[PDB]
RNA sequence: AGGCUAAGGCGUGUCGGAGUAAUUCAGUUAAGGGAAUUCGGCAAAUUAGCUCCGUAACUUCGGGAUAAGGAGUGCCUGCU
RNA sequence: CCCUAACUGGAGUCCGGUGAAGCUUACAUUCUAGUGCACAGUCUAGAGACCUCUAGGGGGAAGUGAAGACCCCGUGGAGC
RNA sequence: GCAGCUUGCUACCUCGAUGUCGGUUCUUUCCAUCCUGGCCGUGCAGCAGCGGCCAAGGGUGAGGUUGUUCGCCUAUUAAAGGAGAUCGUGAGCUGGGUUUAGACCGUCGUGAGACAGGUCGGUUACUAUCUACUAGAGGUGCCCGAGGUCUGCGGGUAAGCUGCUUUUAGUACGAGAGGAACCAAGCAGCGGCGCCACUGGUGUACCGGUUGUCUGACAAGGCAUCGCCGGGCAGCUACGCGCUCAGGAAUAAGAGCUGAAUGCAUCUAAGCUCGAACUCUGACCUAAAAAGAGACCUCUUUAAGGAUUCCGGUAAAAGACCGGUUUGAUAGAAACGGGAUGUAAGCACCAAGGCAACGAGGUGUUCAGUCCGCGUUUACUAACCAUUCGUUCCUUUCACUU
């Protein structure tokens, strides 16, 4: 069972649930949900947004 | 004119498509009897949907062996209890019923239902059967069962429903001798079902009211400029010139769900006994939790949240013993996120 | 052909002008239709991911250009299910010239194939660089 | 112009209603494809203000021209 | 369009009030075949059909609207 | 000779109008069968053809030109058969063509004008009375009164059809080249039925950002399509997901057994065995209004039980249906769980700068604030109060009572 850690969010994927988005380049990114891909779309940043773990470490870095 | 052919628009295989004329479904054909005496029906109420990850199993898929996540329905499934044995002499006519015997001691919320029959004659009337059987008046024998739902939670109702099961034996005395073994007793849906094994289920399907052919039936739309001209949603033509009438297999609008389906070859995939196993966090939505005993039907069954869903052994399984499946993961998050 | 372990919707029809990702000349093919598939009435010709479909060049060199190739897509946008239940979905659809039995015209294959396809034809797994 | 508001004029021309089903008039949105629909892109969608750069064939030398194709644009502080 | 889905307001649906018009010799719960001015719910022989009500799209009533504007005829007209 | 699906012939019906071609939508039928099933012959080695017989259960598609029918062409495909239904289908749609009024070109004519020549443009009416069908109800009949569970006279069904790949097998066959079949497995296309854990759409509940303006400013609000933009739970939905072999009987063509007429022979004249995607049965739906109007059991005969009122939803256009009703978690409140959004207001510090007044914005307070058409706990309020039928009504034509 792979334990799969969303891009945005930073949340563990739940098995059988999840997406996984590849660019042309090759890179892959898991997503939790609908939300979280959306906003990756929309070009926001994870470090930049609070609600999501990589925001909430860039809020604490002070 | 050289005509472009279609298949036809939904399947006239059930029509006329009708609201079902009970809430609970009814067998109109009980399989073969191949081995011990037993029950060859349960019912449980259908509680929601949840996914494992399960090791696949399945003998021949390319998928053997590895990871799956597979679709459950779960369906709560209190113990059941054996009402009545009623026997049924074959004749020329069909199938009559002959005799019938009703428990002595039984629920008494049975009364939401029927006026409770009394504890009045078990033991002649046994005997009676007996004899009936002896001087071969009886061509078989059949269980009365009934659900006692007060014990679940997200089903409001506490008047039980009551269903006609079969008996598979290999003889009618055989038979006999289990019925009575079995009467009045609670029966528990591992006594019915064992996991692995494939089953029928039927239910009442999703109430739609009334619908447009379109939703019924599946007709097309009218397309480009026609989309537009006031008939969209509507069938193109009612019939011919002749003959000067519509048929009845010309798609229309009526009655949508609410009908009694069978669905084959659905794979027990758990018999649990503690709902907390299976529920998630925050319940399932407008249900609530599980409490009593459970079990995992593998995909979909016919029917919403809480309607009685009967399971029978299968009539027409293609594949021989399956195994039990090794589920892994129970997927207990929250349904309503 | 062999059975793919996920459930690929078939996501393009007949008309779509896709890019071509590998090195044969073809910048953009336009699907005509698909190999394998009957339709029904009223119904475009689908494809997804592991679909073989006849295409015209309409980019690209001009020895490629108007000519009618098999492609194999390699890249779909459209989400498909992995049998362990994840979604996959690519960034752009891409596609790569085969022949009937599966061989890429192509030697070299830009950016991620599906391991679908990878898998039902392995000479398109080999030509490419990554396997997603 | 359009939007939101004064003054002034009005609520003036059938009600209620439990999903208020199907269907229909007029709208909003729609994965992937993008005219494959159709007699025909009909209908719908795209673009859109202003500033700056740049603007072809052809031409009756007037034009074509807002051709095409690109960039900027909000708020705050202090100024020329 | 592939191929439809959901939603918004107005109708519709159900309720209170108000309240017309258009088809109509009669009867009438029909269906098949034949017959018949050769395209019948009514004739003939069969087959079906318990009655009433509500909703719904229009197969049929060669549905309704209308002394065919096409063709011919009239020792009928008009204009050119 | 057949058919009447081409074009003719005719003028029997219709001129107080049966709306004219083609397409589209939907249903059905025929077989003279294109594919799929079963066969026979071959100048049939196999592969694959050619010819014929049975067979109408299913399929017979997508595109370019043209109004087209027809036809040509393209790439798939097992195949992309043909025809009938008022050349099915305009109280369904379209209006491209033909069949009005305008105009141009060519050709006729002195001319008006004409052309089964071409071209551009050119109004598609109606609230359904009856019948038919699709669904939903109320009755009456059947019937000890009521309830429950069944049966199945019958009706319907495509209770699915068809390809690819692997294997058989580089085998049989064949000199080679080439190249099968039974069984077995998976997948796919189309169809059918259901479902919403997952994924996508929507989600005018809800949350946030922001433009213009108004309510004096802040805050909180109105309006501009939900103002627009971003996100989105439940619900619904597909672009998502589950299920969707058979076997048996009796047959068609056909292949045989036995067998005389006709000592022999003969698949046939009796008799018998096999033999299809057909038919029937069988795993599905519906079905006591089956007039032979059903079977069984239970309860109870001023009762059983039903309806109405009440709180609801697995149901629902009205009806109906399914539940609960204090011996209760049916619905709601409160709190909590589980979720949506994205860090509220006020306060403090900082803020490019400004002498200052101010200052967009940043940080902390603060995964905050706001919200939940989900669950749990909990009788806290509301499921109370009742009515009505099961009596032909008045009457003493009484099984009774002043």
Redesign the pocket.
């Known amino acids: 069972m792979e334990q799969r850690k969303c891009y945005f969010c930073g949340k563990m994927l739940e098995p059988?649930?999840?997406?996984l988005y590849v660019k042309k380049d090759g890179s892959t990114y898991f997503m939790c949900?609908?939300?979280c891909?959306?906003?990756f779309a929309?070009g926001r940043l994870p470090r930049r947004?609070?609600?999501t773990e990589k925001g909430?470490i860039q809020?604490k870095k002070? | 004119?050289?005509?472009?052919?279609?298949?036809?628009?939904?399947?006239?295989?059930?029509?006329?498509?009708?609201?079902?004329?009970?809430?609970?479904?009814?067998?109109?054909?009980w399989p073969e009897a191949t081995g011990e005496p037993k029950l060859q029906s349960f019912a449980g109420y259908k509680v929601?949907?949840?996914?494992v990850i399960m090791v696949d199993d399945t003998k021949?898929?390319?998928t053997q062996g590895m990871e799956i996540?597979v679709?459950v329905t779960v369906i709560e499934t209190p113990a059941i209890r054996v009402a009545?044995i009623?026997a049924?002499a074959e004749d020329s006519?069909?199938?009559?019923?002959?005799?019938?015997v009703?428990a002595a001691d039984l629920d008494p919320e049975l009364?939401?239902?029927?006026?409770?029959?009394?504890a009045?004659?078990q033991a002649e009337a046994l005997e009676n059967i007996g004899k009936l059987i002896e001087e071969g008046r009886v061509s078989d024998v059949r269980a009365?069962i009934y659900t006692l739902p007060k014990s679940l939670?997200?089903?409001?109702?506490?008047?039980p429903?009551?269903?006609?099961s079969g008996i598979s034996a290999r003889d009618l005395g055989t038979k006999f001798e289990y019925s009575k073994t079995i009467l009045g007793t609670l029966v528990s849906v591992t006594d019915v079902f064992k996991n692995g094994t494939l089953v029928?289920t039927?239910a009442?399907?999703?109430?739609?009211?009334?619908?447009?052919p379109?939703?019924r039936?599946?007709?097309?739309?009218?397309?480009?400029?026609?989309?537009?001209?006031?008939?969209?949603?509507?069938?193109?033509?009612?019939?011919?010139?002749?003959?000067?009438?519509?048929?009845?297999?010309?798609?229309?609008?009526?009655?949508?769900?609410?009908?009694?389906?069978?669905?084959?070859?659905?794979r027990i995939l758990k018999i649990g006994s503690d709902g907390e196993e299976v529920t998630p966090?925050?319940?399932?939505?407008?249900?609530?939790?599980v409490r009593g005993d459970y079990i995992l039907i593998?995909?979909?069954?016919?029917?919403?949240?809480?309607?009685?869903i009967r399971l029978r052994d299968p009539?027409?399984?293609?594949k021989a013993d399956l195994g039990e499946p090794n589920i892994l993961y129970i997927?207990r998050?929250?349904?309503?996120? | 052909?062999?059975?793919?372990r996920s459930?690929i919707?078939?996501?393009?029809?007949?008309?779509?002008?896709?890019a071509c990702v590998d090195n044969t000349g073809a910048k953009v093919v336009e699907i005509?239709?698909?190999?394998?598939?009957?339709?029904?009435?009223?119904?475009?010709?689908?494809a997804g991911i592991g679909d073989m479909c006849?295409v015209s060049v309409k980019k690209g060199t001009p020895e490629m250009r108007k000519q009618?190739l098999l492609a194999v897509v390699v890249r779909?946008?459209?989400?498909f299910?992995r049998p362990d239940?994840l979604?996959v979905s690519f960034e752009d659809?891409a596609m790569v010239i085969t022949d009937e039995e599966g061989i890429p015209k192509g030697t070299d294959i830009k950016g991620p194939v599906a391991r679908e396809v990878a898998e039902r034809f392995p000479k398109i797994g080999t030509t490419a660089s990554i396997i997603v």
């Not at chain 2, 009539?315 to 293609?318: D, H, S, T, V």
């Not at chain 3, 005509?32 to 689908?46: A, D, E, F, L, T």
């Not at chain 3, 779909?76 to 989400?79: A, G, I, L, W, Y």
Request: hydrophobic residues 30%; contains cysteine; positive net charge.
């Open positions: 059988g649930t999840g997406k949900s609908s939300k891909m959306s906003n929309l947004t609070e609600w909430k809020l002070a | 004119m050289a005509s472009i052919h279609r298949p036809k628009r939904g399947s006239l295989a059930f029509s006329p498509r009708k609201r079902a004329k009970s809430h609970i479904p009814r067998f109109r054909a929601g949907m949840t996914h021949n898929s390319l996540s679709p009545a009623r049924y006519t069909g199938e009559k019923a002959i005799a019938e009703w009364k939401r239902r029927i006026p409770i029959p009394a009045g004659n009365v939670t997200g089903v409001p109702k506490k008047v429903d009551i269903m006609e029928d039927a009442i399907t999703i109430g739609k009211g009334t619908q447009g379109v939703k039936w599946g007709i097309q739309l009218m397309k480009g400029k026609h989309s537009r001209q006031g008939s969209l949603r509507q069938v193109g033509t009612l019939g011919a010139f002749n003959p000067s009438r519509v048929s009845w297999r010309v798609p229309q609008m009526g009655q949508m769900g609410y009908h009694q389906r069978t669905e084959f070859n659905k966090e925050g319940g399932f939505i407008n249900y609530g939790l593998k995909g979909s069954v016919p029917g919403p949240s809480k309607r009685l009539i027409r399984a293609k997927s998050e929250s349904k309503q996120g | 052909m062999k059975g793919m459930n919707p078939r996501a393009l029809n007949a008309g779509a002008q896709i005509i239709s698909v190999k394998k598939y009957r339709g029904v009435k009223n119904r475009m010709p689908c006849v009618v779909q946008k459209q989400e299910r239940g979604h659809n």
